[PDB]
């Protein structure tokens, strides 16, 4: 009887959402529906284009149900407030969406409540202003959950999916694979943060006050994450956006999607996560995420940059290029805060910077750098990452680089931190080394015979080559 | 330094309405005057405009219904950061 999606997001060990409010920006809703009646407050904010009765409120009633419905909802308690930014055909405007996000911020200022989750189950093309509005509303302390988009495309070309500081959800099906239907299906790419159930999702149906229907979409998937977030923020009201996003990542099922559904260039960029409620168990622990930069572009002096959240530490930095024409990566200070910067080589199509960002409080972290000479630096606390960058066009707690490159050590004064280094070499297109259970991969890199790049995938260090040795740095309390 | 942006997906563009976005520290009183100035300068040129909304709280700026002919004029207004042509969003 338990619908497949609600079982799917249930942790392997288990036992809400009421100090939290979930705002919904969607079509009108049938607030009388027994799934949601008494739970959803229609603000009657309305800003919609003109069309070109139960069809009208079908979308939003379903999603209101997926978040908070009493039989089929993720956060079965959950107060919701609904705004109407989509007309009866499901069409809205950027400007209307702007006014609704503005309306939520005015309400919060007039009548402060607790943690706020805004669900944006909608998409249009990349929009500077919509992304700006979403970010600034996030910086004001509000959590935004948005759908990746249903176009089987790069989510970074869509808004508010591409919006900075927002949680973008793609859709997976009952086989844990990305939804595909014809040429349509879930978006993907580095702007997607995780995936949630989004095919054949039973929820409230506006046909009648006790009726139910199945719908699919990345809206449905985001509705899952929004109810998941509402329960996390009920349990831990004080979470910052980085701390909630590190928990969503940590508690997701991992390496469960078959990356072959994604276009080749997007497999490395798309996170292999399916969202899940946290278990009954949860002492402090070390959370890290991998943060990919936008592609640098082809200019000869191009740099990609990857940044952590203000309350995260940059524990390592690497780079990747599909052709292998790259000049490595370095860590630099900006605003008293370390960022990850990758260098394009003259004649390459661009590179990615790949930061490893971790919630490590009480951490004083510094960089140790050595110029070209093989090249060596070391710390003199604990080594968390090795980086390397060169100026030429071709060829313990220590880092070692090519004789002609600089190398950089991320060194952290972190008492209570223990780190170990684990290596794996083979005679080979991809070489892999993973941290043991309970440890967190903080740093990944290849020993200096022609490397496309290295990047952390969860707790596995992955080195990509055209003897090759993968080197993983693993830490824990 | 002010720039214009419209949706790269042509069928989603909504010409005729523009989101005029102002520099981060711009005060509501300035937004209202900058909108009134646009209306004024457009009227001196023969264009009716309509200020559909003034933004404050997340972004300063305003939403104007006007012919695109005025984008060169509107981009030179005080406090302007960029202008974006409205476009569609869709249930997903």
């Amino acid at each position: 009887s338990i619908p497949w999606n609600l079982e799917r997001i249930t942790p392997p060990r288990y036992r809400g959402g009421s100090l939290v409010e979930v705002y919904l920006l969607d079509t009108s809703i049938q607030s009388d529906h027994r799934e949601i009646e008494g739970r959803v407050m229609v603000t009657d904010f309305e800003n919609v284009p003109e069309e070109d009765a139960s069809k009208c409120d079908s979308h939003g009633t379903h999603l209101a149900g997926v978040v908070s419905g009493r039989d089929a909802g993720v956060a079965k308690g959950a107060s919701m407030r609904s705004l109407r930014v989509l007309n009866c055909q499901g069409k809205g405007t950027v400007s209307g969406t702007l006014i609704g996000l503005e309306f939520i911020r005015k309400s919060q200022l007039v009548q402060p409540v607790g943690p706020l989750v805004v669900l944006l189950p909608l998409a249009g093309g990349y929009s500077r202003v919509l992304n700006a509005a979403c970010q600034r509303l996030a910086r004001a302390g509000v959590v935004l959950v948005t759908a990746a988009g249903n176009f089987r495309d790069d989510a970074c070309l869509y808004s508010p999916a591409s919006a900075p500081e927002v949680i973008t959800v793609g859709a997976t099906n009952a086989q844990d694979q990305p939804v595909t239907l014809g040429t349509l299906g879930t978006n993907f790419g580095r702007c997607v943060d995780l995936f949630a159930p989004g095919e054949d999702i039973i929820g409230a149906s506006s046909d009648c006050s006790t009726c139910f229907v199945s719908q699919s979409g990345t809206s449905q998937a985001a509705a899952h994450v929004a109810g998941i977030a509402a329960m996390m923020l009920s349990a831990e009201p004080e979470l910052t956006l980085a701390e909630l996003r590190q928990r969503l990542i940590h508690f997701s099922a991992k390496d469960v999607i078959n990356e072959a559904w994604f276009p080749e260039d997007q497999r490395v960029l798309t996170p292999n996560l399916v969202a899940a409620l946290p278990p009954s168990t949860h002492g402090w622990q070390l959370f890290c995420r991998t943060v990919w930069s936008a592609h640098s572009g082809p200019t000869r002096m191009a740099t990609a940059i990857a940044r952590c959240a203000p309350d995260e530490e940059l524990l390592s930095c690497s780079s990747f290029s599909r052709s292998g024409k790259r000049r490595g990566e370095r860590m630099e200070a900006q605003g008293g805060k370390l960022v990850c910067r990758a260098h394009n080589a003259f004649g390459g199509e661009g590179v990615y910077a790949i930061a490893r960002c971790c919630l490590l409080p009480q951490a004083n972290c510094s960089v140790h750098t050595a110029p070209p000479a093989g090249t060596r630096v070391h710390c003199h606390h604990v080594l968390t990452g090795c980086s390397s960058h060169w100026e030429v066009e071709d060829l313990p707690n220590q880092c070692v680089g090519h004789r002609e490159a600089s190398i950089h050590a991320s060194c952290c004064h972190a008492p209570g931190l223990e780190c170990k280094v684990k290596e794996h070499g083979i005679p080979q297109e991809q070489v892999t080394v993973a941290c043991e259970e309970g440890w967190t991969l903080t740093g990944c890199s290849a020993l200096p015979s022609h490397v496309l790049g290295a990047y952390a995938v969860d707790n596995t260090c992955v080195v990509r080559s055209r003897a090759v040795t993968a080197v993983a740095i693993c830490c824990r309390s | 330094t002010a720039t214009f942006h419209r949706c790269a997906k042509d069928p989603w563009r909504l010409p005729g309405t523009y989101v005029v976005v102002l520099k981060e520290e711009t005060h509501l009183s300035q937004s209202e005057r900058t909108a009134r100035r646009l209306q004024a300068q457009a009227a001196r040129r023969g264009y009716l405009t309509k200020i559909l909304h003034v933004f404050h709280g997340l972004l300063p700026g305003f939403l104007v219904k006007m012919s695109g002919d005025l984008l060169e004029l509107a981009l030179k207004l005080p406090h302007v950061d960029y202008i974006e042509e409205d476009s569609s969003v869709f249930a997903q």
């Binding site: 979308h59 998409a123 988009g149 249903n150 176009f151 719908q215 699919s216 979409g217 | 869709f90 249930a91």
Partner: peptide
Amino acid sequence: XTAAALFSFA
């Protein structure tokens, strides 16, 4: 669904 992958992928 027309004209944006709307309503369960059209």
